[PDB]
RNA sequence: UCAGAAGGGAGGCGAAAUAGAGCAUGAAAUCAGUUGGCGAUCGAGCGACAGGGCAUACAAGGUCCCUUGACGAAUGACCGAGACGCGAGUCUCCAGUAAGACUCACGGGAAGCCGAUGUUCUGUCGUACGUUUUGAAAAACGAGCCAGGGAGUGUGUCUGUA
RNA sequence: GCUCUAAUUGGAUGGAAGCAGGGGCGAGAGCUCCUGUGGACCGAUUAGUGACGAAAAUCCUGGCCAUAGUAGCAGCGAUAG
């Protein structure tokens, strides 16, 4: 009796050295939170980024210590942008046709979180018989 | 007070110049080192005696409710001389503060060594006091 | 209203509870933070002694203004809020009950959790001078205990 | 005439409030007051065609 | 059980009673209890960025440390030898050498482990926000807090544009 | 990013929307997954539609904390037990 997550799990696609090296770049780099001016400091104010627009705001005005503001320079390496932290590109699946023409060496799959369990059992199977990972795969319970 | 410090070095302030074993010290107690201060009252200062005698007593001096208090005997002298040379209100400073002790006369069986550039020469200089003196000329009880 | 806010064993332990009590949900606080901990023989003597003045509450939060007492120990402010200590006698006379009904030794049971929740307000108006009026309210309290064997 | 039946008037300074229409103490008729009038609302008079 | 047609306990119904009567769901402000982190010698735009400590069920992230080696931009030596300077020191050669950020490979290691999250500590920078203003942290104006509400719209005509 | 219309096309009681806590992506607006709760609806693409996005207006309405167990429950020629 213990849990084990369905499909290929372990499975990593294959990069090219250039991509891979992007990939461990972005990785390294990182970025600043990007959270909106003193969201900190009342809670009716959320995270979510706005341009600091006042005439007089520290932040808009690039005071060191105030966070960084949004600015192109800060955009992930085109190549591997969007990318799964494994390095697949992800491709979102509703049903079994959508598994048709995935490539499970570059790409892993997830599946929408309102597909239920009948139709997850079956896209699960198909897929790793595609080769194709699960990235939200189902645990099911199997022997110690 | 005659709790026995445990000093990595001990220094004997007798003919030196306050401010200049202050400023080693301090750098020191900030190193690391626990240093006891030996024969405070035999320290000196130079110049006009009437000028430096002012200044100190203008410290005794000033204050209020809140309060500024400034010691008069030659040890305490020597204290707050070396607390100006440490950033005494953050952490590492206050630690290294607390390893710096300053006594009158020799507590130690060893007698203490004399750092460089510190020493006044007595028989090229007739203008300068001894901390004891300015101790005397404040009012303090002169135990040493 | 509330729910018990913490897990019990239903073999080791007794349940109570008060509704709607109108009474201070400050020193409801006050006493339930003195009395866990005790047994509910211990609580009961305690709260009796209370109500005739030999022992003091100790407010620990709900202070302002409030007179020292001696026997207050570790602290100084304290009171004798006897109307919420007599209701919290009726929340033990209840657990002590429901606990003997049980095949329990009531009185020797140890608190575990005493908490009082403040569940509401009974609304009231005072008429003012120059004409307006303002609130004078009543608070509404809820109070769990749960009783444990030793 | 949505929100606009009321003889609601504004105070105006004195008695450190906003100056808002008032009727009965309740903020009435303009479009940031709760049951004042919708101030761009949809139009019949548009041509929709 | 209780002064009790109250309330409580136990129990019953139902898929569900945390659907039990203003009873679907049940946010925030906020309250009680409790957990983690800090804590009664210490300083205040509450943070950003970097780095420590303590804390962490799974899932949805899987990285990370150390020795050695490969590659190696700008930059770039010690020591040693020769020569110069009153002196601090400098020049020439060793040498664009050793070193040199990232990345990778072999071997070894970590599973509260790496990331991340909570809290706290250290470093650097930092006197909110919006508005008025030549100049706002301002002893200029506004808001107690949170949720929800809250401001370029229609007709006609004219003039451009795609 | 929000509403509703249309065409094309999908998901849901083998658990939709919402909500709480958490994982991933995007410079970002925001997208998305996991767990719990919930118990019936929900999207995507394209072309439209508009009562479409709030930290602020002594803004509106409702709820709520501190204030605080604080002021008052004394004062009056009627001090009343
Ligand atoms: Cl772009
Ligand atoms: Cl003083
Ligand atoms: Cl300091
Ligand atoms: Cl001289
Ligand atoms: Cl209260
Ligand atoms: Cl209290
Ligand atoms: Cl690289
Ligand atoms: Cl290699
Ligand atoms: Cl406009
Ligand atoms: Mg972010
Ligand atoms: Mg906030
Ligand atoms: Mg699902
Ligand atoms: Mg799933
Ligand atoms: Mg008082
Ligand atoms: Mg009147
Ligand atoms: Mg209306
Ligand atoms: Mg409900
Ligand atoms: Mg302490
Ligand atoms: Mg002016
Ligand atoms: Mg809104
Ligand atoms: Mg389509
Ligand atoms: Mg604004
Ligand atoms: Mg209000
Ligand atoms: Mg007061
Ligand atoms: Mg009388
Ligand atoms: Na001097
Ligand atoms: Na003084
Ligand atoms: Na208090
Ligand atoms: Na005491
Ligand atoms: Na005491
Ligand atoms: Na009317
Ligand atoms: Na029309
Ligand atoms: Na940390
Ligand atoms: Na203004
Ligand atoms: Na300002
Ligand atoms: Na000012
Ligand atoms: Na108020
Ligand atoms: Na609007
Ligand atoms: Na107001």
């Given at each position: 009796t213990?849990?084990?997550?369905r ?8 990069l ?6 992007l990939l ?6 990182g970025?600043?939170?990007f959270?909106r ?8 104010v959320?995270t979510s ?19 960084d503001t949004?600015?192109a320079?800060?955009?992930s ?9 494994s390095?697949?590109?992800?491709v ?6 959508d ?13 929408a ?9 079956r896209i699960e199977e198909?897929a790793?018989?595609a080769?194709?990972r699960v990235?939200?795969?189902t645990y ?5 | ?12 302030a007798?003919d ?5 074993v202050?400023?080693?010290?301090a750098?020191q ?6 240093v006891?201060?030996?024969?405070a009252e035999?320290?000196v200062?130079?110049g006009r005696?009437?000028?430096?005698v002012?200044?100190y007593?203008?410290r ?8 500024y208090?400034?010691?008069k ?16 209100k953050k952490q590492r400073?206050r630690?290294a ?8 006369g020799?507590?130690?069986?060893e ?8 020493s006044?020469d ?10 004891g003196?300015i101790?005397e000329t404040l009012?303090?009880n002169?135990?040493? | 209203?509330?729910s018990?806010?913490?897990?019990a ?13 109108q009474?201070?949900?400050k020193?409801?606080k006050?006493?339930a ?22 022992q ?6 709900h202070?302002?203004?409030?007179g020292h007492?001696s ?5 100084d ?20 009950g429901?606990?003997?009904h ?7 049971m140890?608190?575990?959790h005493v908490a009082?929740?403040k569940?509401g ?20 309290v809820?109070?769990?205990?749960i009783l444990?064997?030793? | 005439?949505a ?15 906003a ?5 009965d103490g309740?903020?009435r008729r303009?479009?940031?007051?709760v ?9 019949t ?5």
């Amino acid at each position: 009796t213990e849990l084990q997550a369905r499909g290929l799990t372990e499975k990593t696609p294959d990069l090219s050295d250039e991509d891979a090296r992007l990939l461990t770049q972005r990785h390294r780099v990182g970025k600043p939170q990007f959270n909106r001016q003193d969201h900190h400091k009342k809670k009716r104010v959320s995270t979510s980024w706005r341009k600091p627009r006042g005439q007089l705001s520290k932040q808009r005005r690039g005071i060191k210590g105030k966070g960084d503001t949004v600015e192109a320079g800060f955009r992930s390496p085109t190549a591997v942008r969007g990318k799964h932290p494994s390095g697949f590109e992800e491709v979102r699946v509703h049903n079994v046709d959508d598994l048709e023409g995935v490539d499970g060496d570059t790409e892993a799959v997830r599946i929408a979180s309102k597909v239920g369990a009948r139709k997850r059992e079956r896209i699960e199977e198909e897929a790793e018989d595609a080769g194709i990972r699960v990235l939200n795969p189902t645990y099911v319970e199997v022997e110690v | 007070s005659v709790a026995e410090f445990d000093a990595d070095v001990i220094v004997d302030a007798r003919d030196c110049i306050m401010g200049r074993v202050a400023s080693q010290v301090a750098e020191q107690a900030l190193d690391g080192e626990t240093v006891a201060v030996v024969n405070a009252e035999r320290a000196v200062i130079t110049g006009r005696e009437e000028q430096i005698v002012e200044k100190y007593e203008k410290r005794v001096d000033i204050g209020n409710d809140n309060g500024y208090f400034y010691p008069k005997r030659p040890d305490g002298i020597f204290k707050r001389t070396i607390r100006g040379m440490l950033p005494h209100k953050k952490q590492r400073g206050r630690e290294a503060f607390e390893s710096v002790r300053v006594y009158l006369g020799n507590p130690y069986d060893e007698d203490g060594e004399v750092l460089d550039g510190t020493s006044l020469d007595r028989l090229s200089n007739i203008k300068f006091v001894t901390l004891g003196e300015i101790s005397e000329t404040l009012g303090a009880n002169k135990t040493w | 209203g509330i729910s018990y806010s913490v897990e019990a064993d239903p073999d080791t332990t007794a349940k109570a509870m008060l509704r709607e009590r109108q009474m201070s949900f400050k020193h409801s606080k006050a006493i339930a933070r003195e009395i866990k901990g005790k047994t509910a023989g211990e609580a009961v003597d305690y709260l009796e002694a209370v109500i005739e003045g030999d022992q003091p509450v100790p407010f620990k939060q709900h202070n302002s203004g409030v007179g020292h007492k001696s026997k207050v120990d570790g602290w100084d402010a304290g009171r004798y809020p006897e109307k919420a200590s007599k209701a919290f006698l009726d929340l033990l006379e209840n657990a002590v009950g429901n606990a003997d009904h049980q095949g329990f030794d009531g009185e020797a049971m140890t608190i575990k959790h005493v908490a009082a929740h403040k569940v509401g307000e009974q609304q009231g108006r005072k008429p003012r001078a120059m004409g307006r009026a303002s609130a004078w309210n009543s608070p509404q309290v809820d109070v769990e205990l749960i009783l444990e064997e030793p | 005439y949505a929100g606009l039946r009321t003889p609601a008037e504004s105070f105006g300074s004195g008695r450190g409030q906003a100056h808002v229409p008032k009727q009965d103490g309740r903020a009435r008729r303009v479009p940031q007051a709760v049951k004042g009038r919708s101030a761009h609302p949809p139009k019949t008079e548009k041509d929709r065609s």
